């Protein structure tokens, strides 16, 4: 019922601006505040009551509110404003307080960069236990956010998926895993899998075959 | 000036009860402008309001949730206790506890100005067991190629990978785990080497993991097909 963009870009330097929506129920009549976190860490406030800063906040941030939406501003922005922007307000129909979905900040500089893509077969040390698990490793690709499709000959796979979320290598680029889990028999049962990693509308995938030869 | 810390289990399993504590420093629950917050945050998802206790024990707990959660508190000793019930493996997440100050008569104008650094809980069934590790091996004409060892199905975390007892370092990307539904975690490790040395030299993946005193090698031979 608070509602933000999932993500927000900006160049160094520059104002950006991250929104959020609500209704008369909440925003409308309540005090937003403001908090942000780093990667890995602990939320900070940055805004209360709508519009207030506590001391040792910059005063780069700011916040604002009009009608039924609040905004916070961040002016000057630097490298390590990178966070997840989240808004509170309580909310009387609702009896309880509600936070935003919160805004991945970006902080535009490192070039578009796209996906390494290693996939692996079940060994046969696991085809023994009559599990197969295929690996798809996906690394060094800029943003840090990927789509993972698995493909079974021709067709769609859907079950037994199970994708990470995209992390930070030591090089600033990131990384992701997927994992298809299947049994032997099912391995076996097609000529064809494939892993398909799409990356800012671009496509790369890997193709592996249970006839290795 | 003021900290918080959470203390409780980093694990519970399914329909158990969840008791986390939250200590702190640096002001008084005493405080008529004060109060005590629980927020929870799953692994890449928003912040979550679980429940507030309030220096005159007002308390302000999530409607969602009214039915599994109660909260007290031990002033004279900064303490404050949450209880969550019959845990279910959607509650994996951080649970942080914060200080919460507000304008005394004021419209719910209460901000979370103080924050404890939030203990991960994980909500699984599992009992600690040490992972199955398996070779993963290519499709060799390109100039390097990536050998790897998949770590799967342990508990907890951590576990260490290394390659050659630590003798080879470069070309080693080591990929976060996943949490699998079935509760056990999956890792897996790969080295990128020369194709030109892999019938000169040896690949071999050390996987450690300490709650199980578990201690796997692992040799990664390449699958060579007929010319
Ligand atoms: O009621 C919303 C209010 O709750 C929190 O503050 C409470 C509130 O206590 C009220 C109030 O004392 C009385 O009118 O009825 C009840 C017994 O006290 C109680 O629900 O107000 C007082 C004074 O402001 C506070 O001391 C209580 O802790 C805060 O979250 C407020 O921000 C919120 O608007
Ligand atoms: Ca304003
Ligand atoms: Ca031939």
């Known amino acids: 019922v608070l509602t933000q963009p999932p993500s927000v870009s900006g160049a160094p330097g520059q104002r950006v601006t991250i929104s959020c929506a609500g209704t008369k129920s909440n925003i409308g009549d309540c005090s937003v505040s403001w908090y942000q976190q780093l990667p890995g860490a602990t939320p900070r406030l940055l805004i209360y009551?709508?519009?207030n800063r506590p001391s040792g906040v910059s005063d780069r941030f700011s916040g604002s509110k009009s009608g039924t939406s609040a905004s916070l501003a961040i002016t000057g922005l630097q490298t390590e404003d990178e966070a997840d922007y989240f808004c509170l307000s309580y909310d009387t129909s609702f009896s309880g307080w509600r936070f935003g979905g919160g805004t991945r900040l970006t902080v535009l500089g490192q070039p578009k960069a796209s996906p390494t893509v290693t996939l692996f077969p079940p060994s046969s040390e696991e085809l023994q236990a009559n599990k197969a698990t295929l690996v798809c490793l996906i690394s060094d690709f800029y943003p840090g956010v990927v789509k993972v499709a698995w493909k079974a000959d021709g067709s769609a796979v859907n079950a037994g998926v199970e994708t990470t979320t995209p992390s930070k290598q030591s090089n600033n680029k990131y990384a992701a895993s997927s994992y298809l889990s299947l049994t032997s028999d099912q391995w076996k049962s097609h000529k064809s899998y494939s892993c398909q990693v799409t990356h800012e509308g671009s496509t790369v995938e890997k193709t592996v075959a249970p006839a290795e030869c | 000036q003021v900290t918080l810390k959470e203390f409780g289990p980093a694990l519970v399993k399914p329909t158990q009860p969840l008791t986390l504590t939250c200590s702190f420093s640096g002001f008084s629950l005493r405080s008529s402008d004060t109060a005590v917050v629980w927020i929870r945050q799953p692994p890449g998802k928003a912040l979550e309001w679980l429940a507030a206790?309030?220096?005159?024990?007002?308390?302000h707990i999530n409607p969602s949730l009214k039915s599994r959660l109660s909260i007290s508190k031990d002033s004279p000793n900064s303490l404050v206790v949450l209880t969550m019930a019959n845990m279910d493996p959607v509650d994996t997440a951080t649970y942080y506890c914060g200080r919460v100050r507000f304008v005394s008569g004021g419209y719910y104008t209460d901000r979370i100005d103080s924050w404890g650094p939030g203990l991960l809980v994980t909500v699984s069934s599992a009992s600690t067991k040490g992972p199955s590790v398996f070779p993963l091996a290519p499709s060799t004409s390109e100039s390097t190629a990536a050998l790897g060892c998949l770590v799967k199905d342990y508990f907890p975390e951590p576990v260490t990978v290394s390659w050659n007892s630590g003798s080879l370092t470069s070309g080693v990307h080591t990929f976060p785990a996943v949490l699998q539904s079935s509760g056990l975690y999956s890792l897996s490790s790969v080295v990128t080497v020369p194709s030109s040395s892999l019938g000169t030299q040896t690949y071999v993946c050390n996987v450690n993991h300490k709650p199980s005193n578990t201690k796997v090698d692992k040799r990664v031979e390449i699958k060579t097909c007929g010319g």
């Open positions: 009551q709508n519009n």
């Open positions: 206790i309030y220096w005159d024990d007002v308390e």
